[PDB]
Design a protein around this ligand. Structure first.
Ligand SMILES: [Ca+2]
Ligand SMILES: [Ca+2]
Ligand SMILES: [Ca+2]
Length: 269
């Protein structure tokens, strides 16, 4: 383990996660950054192939365990349904710098999407804070004349509607350790802090893009009404799937794949 990883786990146990995330963001300021016009680039990962004209481009999350592997299950369920590629968030692996703004990351990822897709249509998807990153990427793409056909936001908690995420921060942190299939090293933990700060200060812009909100079917803890659910401030359609914030996209990834297929044309709209 490492001091940072042990500290994170103790932040969960002791109810001081917000404090610890603010520390990790502070520390991140001492790492190398990129600003979008210094020559940094990245590539997309090919995850599955499928029929049709529309690729599902999935953006990695911002958790310290996040990465293109978070979509292995979803991509397996979409194999033979639609092509699937994944966008990494830069700075979670060795040798990669961190973005100095949302605009920086969105620019390098949009470069990669355009280089890989050409004029082949696509939708952008992400989960949790990765859904904020996905929408920012979709926005960038639209502002460059390659809009996506739509955006899939999986269990998104936007700025100003994060009350359940805040109530559950300890539970979330303990669950991340129970589901640590990629080790939380110090590169990942400082990248967590950096992206948590970026996404917390950002605000989405209205785009008019078709949007599918995919919600967990149950809360990670007891709630008095339905105000614990993910939400989105702009026009969207909504579906729910089995599972909670974590299991919905892993154990129940097939349910997600089914709604994506219907939304891409496999229902009756
Ligand atoms: Ca510069
Ligand atoms: Ca490392
Ligand atoms: Ca289909």
């Amino acid at each position: 383990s490492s001091a940072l990883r042990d500290g994170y786990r103790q932040a969960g146990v002791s109810g001081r996660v917000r404090s610890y995330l603010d520390l990790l963001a502070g520390l991140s300021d001492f790492r190398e950054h990129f600003d979008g016009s210094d020559g940094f680039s990245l590539d997309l990962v090919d995850m599955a192939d499928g029929p049709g004209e529309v690729t599902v481009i999935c953006c990695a999350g911002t958790a310290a365990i996040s990465g293109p592997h978070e979509f292995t299950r979803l991509a397996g369920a979409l194999r033979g349904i639609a092509p699937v590629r994944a966008v990494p968030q830069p700075g979670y692996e060795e040798g990669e710098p961190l973005p100095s703004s949302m605009a920086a990351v969105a620019a390098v990822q949009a470069d990669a999407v355009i280089r890989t897709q050409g004029d082949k249509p696509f939708v952008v998807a992400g989960h949790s804070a990765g859904a904020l990153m996905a929408y920012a990427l979709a926005t960038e793409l639209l502002d460059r004349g390659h809009p996506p056909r739509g955006v899939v936001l999986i269990d998104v908690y936007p700025p100003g509607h994060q009350d359940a995420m805040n109530a559950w921060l300890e539970e979330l942190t303990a669950t991340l350790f129970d589901r640590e299939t990629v080790r939380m090293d110090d590169t990942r933990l400082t990248a967590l802090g950096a992206y948590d700060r970026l996404t917390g200060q950002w605000r989405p812009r209205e785009t008019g893009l078709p949007t599918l909100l995919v919600s967990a079917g149950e809360p990670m803890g007891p709630w008095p009404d339905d105000s614990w659910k993910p939400t989105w401030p702009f026009e969207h359609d909504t579906v729910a799937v089995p599972g909670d914030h974590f299991t919905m996209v892993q154990e129940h990834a097939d349910a997600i794949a089914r709604h994506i297929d219907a939304w891409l044309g496999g229902g009756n709209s």
